[PDB]
UniProtKB/Swiss-Prot annotation:
Residues 2-112 form the Bromo domain. Changing D23E: Found in a case of clear cell renal carcinoma; somatic mutation. Component of the SWI/SNF-B (PBAF) chromatin remodeling complex, at least composed of SMARCA4/BRG1, SMARCB1/BAF47/SNF5, ACTL6A/BAF53A or ACTL6B/BAF53B, SMARCE1/BAF57, SMARCD1/BAF60A, SMARCD2/BAF60B, perhaps SMARCD3/BAF60C, SMARCC1/BAF155, SMARCC2/BAF170, PBRM1/BAF180, ARID2/BAF200 and actin. Interacts with PHF10/BAF45A. Interacts with acetylated 'Lys-14' of histone H3 (H3K14ac), and may also interact with other acetylated or methylated Lys residues on histone H3. This is Protein polybromo-1. The modification Phosphoserine is found at S38. Involved in transcriptional activation and repression of select genes by chromatin remodeling (alteration of DNA-nucleosome topology). Required for the stability of the SWI/SNF chromatin remodeling complex SWI/SNF-B (PBAF). Acts as a negative regulator of cell proliferation. The chain holds residues 652 to 766 of 1689 of the full protein.
């Protein structure tokens, strides 16, 4: 009950790798991605993005034990970063940060392929 299954441990490790990542200056890139603002605060996002995603949604799904494999969680992260890179321009910091975290995600999945 305290003890997570191997799949649960792996899901958590991937999630935490993205969440905890800090650049060389100590900035936690996940900060902005934790929770989307509301429809009144970010209207153009909701009018243009088909499938809203934030890390709270991912975390809630993980904590409900609803991901069956690592690929399913990775797909939600990838959706989130592609959403960020669709809504925001390439010159923007949120776009750039999404690309870094997307690399962190994939590198973490690859680092754990034998686990
Ligand atoms: C202002 C917050 C923000 N602007 N553009 C965004 O794109 C996103 O994909 C996203 C995902 C989770 C939390 C915030 C944002 C976001």
């Amino acid at each position: 009950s305290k003890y997570m299954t191997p799949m649960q441990q792996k899901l958590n490790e991937v999630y935490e790798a993205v969440k905890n990542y800090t650049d060389k200056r100590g900035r936690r890139l996940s900060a902005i991605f934790l929770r989307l603002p509301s429809r009144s605060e970010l209207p153009d996002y909701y009018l243009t993005i088909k499938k809203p995603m934030d890390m709270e949604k991912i975390r809630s799904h993980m904590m409900a034990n609803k991901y069956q494999d690592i690929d399913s969680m990775v797909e939600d992260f990838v959706m989130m970063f592609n959403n960020a890179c669709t809504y925001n321009e390439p010159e923007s910091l949120i776009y750039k940060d999404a690309l870094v975290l997307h690399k962190v995600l994939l590198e973490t999945r690859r680092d754990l392929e034998g686990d």
